[PDB]
Amino acid sequence: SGPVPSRARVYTDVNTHRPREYWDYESHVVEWGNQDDYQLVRKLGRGKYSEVFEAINITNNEKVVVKILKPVKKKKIKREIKILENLRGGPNIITLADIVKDPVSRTPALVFEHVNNTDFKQLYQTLTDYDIRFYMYEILKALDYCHSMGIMHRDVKPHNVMIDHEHRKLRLIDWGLAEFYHPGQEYNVRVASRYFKGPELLVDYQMYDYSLDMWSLGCMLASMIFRKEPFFHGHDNYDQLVRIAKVLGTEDLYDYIDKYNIELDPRFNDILGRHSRKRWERFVHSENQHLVSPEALDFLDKLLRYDHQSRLTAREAMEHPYFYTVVKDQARM
Ligand SMILES: Brc1ccc2nn[nH]c2c1Br
Ligand SMILES: Brc1ccc2nn[nH]c2c1Br
Ligand code: NA
């Protein structure tokens, strides 16, 4: 007997109610620009896989960011373009400005409106309590928007959050793993970086939704308020679930397994063992106590649930008491 089917609790049918062309990215017709409008200035430090550059638009002298889409399926390129076009102008969403190909190389590139190469990872272990709440709220605006637009990001992590801390501006970047949510669709579980992978990915439950992003956000929040990077520090994808099980406990894990009739990979049998659900107080110490409050712990607890259906939505998260002072100060200013 197969796994039990699942639906998103929110924004379940938004793509069904759209015209086919909104989400049918394989049939999207891209008018490919010319690279000659742009001059690359310097390579942005994004590690070994990346080809991201600061560039100049020659015509207007405006600074842009260029991402060279190194060889991968045509299908993945049209998916990222269509998602960026659909989300263009959304709150805290990076703005796609142009789509170009090398005249000779024929390699496709995305041009984005300029942001400083200063990610949340470089800032997010040195912020005040108020600033963690502020930036988390800004990330939730981007996630509620993309979820409301029928899209899951699937790669929420500090490296994909660009922050201009002087202007208190944030952008959610790298939509290369993002997908359209369709009720009943079984998705690839080989998404997200190890430390941010939701339990659904680790146990191979394919009928996941927007709630995957809310697990990743919880992992980010835990690492920031406890100053523990990453929070769930697995050796590999198998040990990753063990690190979660040692915190969330094994009772709720096996109840989740039972509820969705998930066939657990046999490897897990020897390694998961039996663990109590730990009180969050265990992670609190003298160097992180100024970031931890009852409000923060209540909010974190409601994000980090095995059962994806149980997790706060982005909109429910934005209504949590943890953000009351952020919401007040936003209206006031
Ligand atoms: Br936009 C762009 C994209 C790729 C490029 N490679 N050489 N110069 C390039 C420019 Br300008
Ligand atoms: Br900055 C920036 C802006 C948009 C991006 N999309 N993928 N990677 C990106 C980077 Br790095
Ligand atoms: Na405290």
Numbering used by the authors: 2 to 334
What does the original paper state about this entry?
CK2 is a constitutively active pleiotropic serine/threonine protein kinase that belongs to the CMGC group of eukaryotic protein kinases (EPKs). The CK2α subunit has a typical eukaryotic protein kinase (EPK) fold with a smaller N-terminal lobe consisting mostly of β-strands and the functionally important C-helix and a larger C-terminal lobe that is predominantly α-helical and harbors catalytically relevant loops. Halogenated benzotriazoles act as ATP-competitive inhibitors with unexpectedly good selectivity for CK2 over other EPKs. Here, we present a set of crystal structures of eight halogenated benzotriazoles in complex with a catalytic subunit of human protein kinase CK2.
The canonical binding mode is observed for 4-BrBt, 5-BrBt, 4,5-Br2Bt, 4,6-Br2Bt, 5,6-Br2Bt, and 4,5,6-Br3Bt. For 4,5-Br2Bt, one of the binding modes is similar to the canonical one, and the second one is 180° rotated, so that the positions of the 5-bromo substituent and the N8 nitrogen are roughly preserved but the ligand is flipped. The canonical binding pose of bromobenzotriazoles in the hCK2α-binding pocket orients the triazole toward the active site lysine (K68) and the phenyl ring toward the hinge region. In the cases where this is possible (for compounds with the 4-bromo substituent), the halogen bond may instead be formed with one of the conformers of R47 or N118. The arginine is anchored in the P-loop region that in these cases adopts at least two distinct conformations; the asparagine belongs to the hinge region. In contrast, 5-, 4,5-, 4,6-, and 4,5,7-bromobenzotriazoles bind hCK2α with substantially lower affinities, and 4,7- and 4-bromobenzotriazoles virtually do not bind to the enzyme.
